[PDB]
Amino acid sequence: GVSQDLPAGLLDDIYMWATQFGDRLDEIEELLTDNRIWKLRTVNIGTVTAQDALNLGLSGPMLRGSGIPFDIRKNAPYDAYDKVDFDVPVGMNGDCYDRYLIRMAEFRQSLRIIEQCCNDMPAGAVKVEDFKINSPPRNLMKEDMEALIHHFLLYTKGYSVPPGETYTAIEAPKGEMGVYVVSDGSERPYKCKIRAPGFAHLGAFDHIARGHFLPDAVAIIGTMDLVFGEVDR
Amino acid sequence: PSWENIKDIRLDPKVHVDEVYEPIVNPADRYLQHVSDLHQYAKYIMAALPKYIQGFSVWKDELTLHVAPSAVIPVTTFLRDNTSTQYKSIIDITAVDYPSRENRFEVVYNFLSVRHNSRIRLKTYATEVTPVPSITCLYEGANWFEREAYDMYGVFFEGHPDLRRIMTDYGFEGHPLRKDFPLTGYTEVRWDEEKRRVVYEPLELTQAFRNFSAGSTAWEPVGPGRDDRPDSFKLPTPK
């Protein structure tokens, strides 16, 4: 679940932030979206067709740059994205310009999530209910014998995961990011593997950057958005 | 109409519950119907390619086809091209070594059909010396993935342009993600002042690595668990 509960007055503060971030973003939008220099630098740069966007394994803003309506939080939803209403931007030409426009719109959609989630926040527990996978609170483990036993064991040994394998993918803002973890049945993972989006984006670099000029080899790095914690680990 | 006369929201009547009501339910119960669907789909695929599909496993919302190594290119082709499957996007391929098996590595392949919104896994096997055939013939995004599975595990992909190491040191001898390879490795780096270069030396630590895996449980922590195999896909008891 979550590490601990929110502080005492933060829900009233994210609202106060969002009220002004709505215009702080339109302001950044104005000197780039219809800048003719920013336009000419990225209009037919980095074009990927929708059929080889699948063959390269591209996802997120690069797959939706090419016209394909696919994102995980609508298609295979998780973590209370069912309960929150929003729409999705998808470009039409496979270029750096539509990959820019869908980010500038995903800003807006994320702000829509934030205000819907501040309005619809319920009460209740913030961690999972049982003390065999995460710790009791310190009010309890200092007087409860069971809870002191569970607190002592979840930190020395840890909890045990049942034996199995899973590939779980969510939508990072870079793209589809997944993890393939093999559980022995022990308290250490037998195997973990991170599928980073930017690994497949940088592997796809040769396929796109053929026949571009040298300056337009730099504007295409900034659309696959390589942070390099992703690409090598 | 001012920023002086704007209302505060800290002074407000807020939500307050006496008591929270959350019903308890098994998370595996929401999958079951789709899991049954997945079973039927897999029983079709094995019936469609009996020469090439040794097995399958359905855990919970996740399908795995168990396929032999010389059987991988006829299966992936099928998964790319059949109108029912259409597993266009390569997602993630890698290896896992089980040193207790004869064929040490198993090589897993993850595919996404963005049409039908479905994932599939393909498992083959490989020894340290014997290859797996490469699917970079079909997928141009696969080869880097194959290449990473080369460097961390030593698994080969026959028919691969530019198989070499990636995300490791150039003169690195060893395959790191491998149970005989130690954690801290074999060598270390320092600046030799005499030769005015970095030298690579056998490894030595100022604090030795202390694993606390010695000291695990002596009681087996989880049961066998229940099944979500449907009654359609298990053998009938006689009478």
Added chain:
Amino acid sequence: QSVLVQMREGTPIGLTGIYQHPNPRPALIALYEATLKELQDKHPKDSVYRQSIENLTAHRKQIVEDNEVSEVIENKIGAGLIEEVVIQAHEELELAKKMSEWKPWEELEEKPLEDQWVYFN
């Protein structure tokens, strides 16, 4: 004779790389008939593979010959646009051509060992 499957320039379309394809349903029908002829030619009729792609291309061919507008059929077909559907029918045609060289209705040639495929109970 020769058939067109994918326009790579022309009137633009919602997807990148694909363009609007002139006269889709003759190319569609001819692709379907090539698939059914190839498949009844070179596969044994006990095959589950052959039976299913027979019934599948027969169902799609029936839908394409019945209705006459294009976006009545692309909602009844259930795949994407008909440029996509023609690409898919071409793809199942070349899949069906490869399957008779690979011959996958046989028994499996590579049986696993039993130390193979055990996962920590």
Added chain:
Amino acid sequence: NIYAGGSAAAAPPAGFRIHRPATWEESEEGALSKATKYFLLAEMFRGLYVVLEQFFRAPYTIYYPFEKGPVSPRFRGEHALRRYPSGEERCIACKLCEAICPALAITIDAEERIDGSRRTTKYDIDMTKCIYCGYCQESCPVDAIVETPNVEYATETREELLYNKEKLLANGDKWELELQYALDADAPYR
């Protein structure tokens, strides 16, 4: 109905067909209107006027050693071994902070002292391999080690950056008035 096979109810949506892009002759703007915006750089000037507006507003810069930025009490900086009221070391050598530490920074040796009480002989943190996860503070039942919000302790040698028991007891001495403020606001939330 019944669908085909390769066919779900995920048909194309009503309106997934594009409209054909407009030619030059089917446009509402005149050539004169369109090319006045071309040669007189209209939206370039609009984006120019944006940052001109921004010249005339208040900057955000705070002056760092004279004005510090945000603090929550949850924040984590250097380490401190606290003491009881009436001065007792609190560290009952339970090895939990060592067992949980994700980067193996803690090392402890523990011996029974003359009182028969259980204390650490040796406590040590490598601050070069510390990662500030706070698990060592979350784990301690006595709440003996904490994270003070000090981040301003930057050193010049590695030897200075290896904190034994004595440096951490001096830290828990020095920051104790502050750690009162931190744990008065954190302890219910823990």
Added chain:
Amino acid sequence: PSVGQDLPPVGGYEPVQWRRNLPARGFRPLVYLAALCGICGYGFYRALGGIQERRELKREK
């Protein structure tokens, strides 16, 4: 039970702005072109007048 948490308001917050606020500003482009031609033509009036005066001054000298 739940006591002392951060909770939302009894009626919720009022909606923030997530649409694009890019209103089309300025005159029509033909207004700017007409003003440009008017300014430039008046400048040509004064400039060509001054050249003719300077020619008459040169005649005098």
Added chain:
Amino acid sequence: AIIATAFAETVKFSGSKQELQKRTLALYRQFLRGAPTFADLYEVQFSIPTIRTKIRQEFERHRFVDDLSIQNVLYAKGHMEYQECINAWKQQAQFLKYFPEEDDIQGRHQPSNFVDKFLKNRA
């Protein structure tokens, strides 16, 4: 990545021992043709026949290997090594991994006997 690197080879496994012997001798020829560009490229102290004797010595390490698959894995590792060395990707500090013996004398007191191994308990 449809275009591959310059000194690439599609990795291909031989069912015959002799065609792998053909490929091994071709690889030795590639290495020894490239010894002078290795001497220029990595700014080395010594001269080219020491690169050539190291290439020959690294091949006489693996001469009496019988099993054909192990010789295939050996040939693939060797071609990857050639491709790294020829393309100037390896640097001088890892090019001189191959020469631990040549750079310096590491000092006195080389233990040979049991007793001078014993006096420093193999150190």
Added chain:
Amino acid sequence: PFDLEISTLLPYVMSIYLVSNYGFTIVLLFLLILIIGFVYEINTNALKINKHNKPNTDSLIYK
């Protein structure tokens, strides 16, 4: 050759009063003769560096 034209205008614009109505037309003819070589240059697309790889426009035919 364009730079040599720009400094060929430089004797004219100093003599502009003395050759009034006559050197005006000679300069008009001079400028237009060089405008024709310029429209040669931009009709030929001479100063472009153009990218060698297309989307490969050629369609997908079969059999």
Added chain:
Amino acid sequence: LPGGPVPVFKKYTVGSKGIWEKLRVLLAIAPNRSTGNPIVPLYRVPTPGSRPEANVYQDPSSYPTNDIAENPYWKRDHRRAYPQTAFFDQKTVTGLLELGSEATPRIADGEAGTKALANIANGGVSFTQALGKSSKDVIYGEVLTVNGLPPVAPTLAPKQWKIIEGEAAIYPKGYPCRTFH
């Protein structure tokens, strides 16, 4: 238009006062734009180490879990109620094709049905032999769809798209990006 332009007195930002605001509504692109700087008496007062809500906080709970007396843990444990991977070889699929199912038992002779199980468990039959032996409506019942079609690759929750194209869209027409919902 539910999330449309709001004026800048509902935006919690320091703004301006006096006739300087009458000057900046004439000198603006959109007059309903904030200045960026949050209102100091509103934004983060009281500071987070000084909160009256911290002394009243108690740890939260749901009812059928914090319940003191009626629940035992083995009824609401689900880590030990995990399902396992149903691993199927080819000979158990031959067994499912020839003997039947627990929904569909094609087995009489229970005493002899054990030894009818046995030879397939030994590998008497093979799988393509089972596909040839088996009926056409068992092929169209259990292997294929009841209409004879291949089963489509299953998804858990299908997503039907609905393109928003009017002025409820995020970009007006002429921009190369579309809202898909």
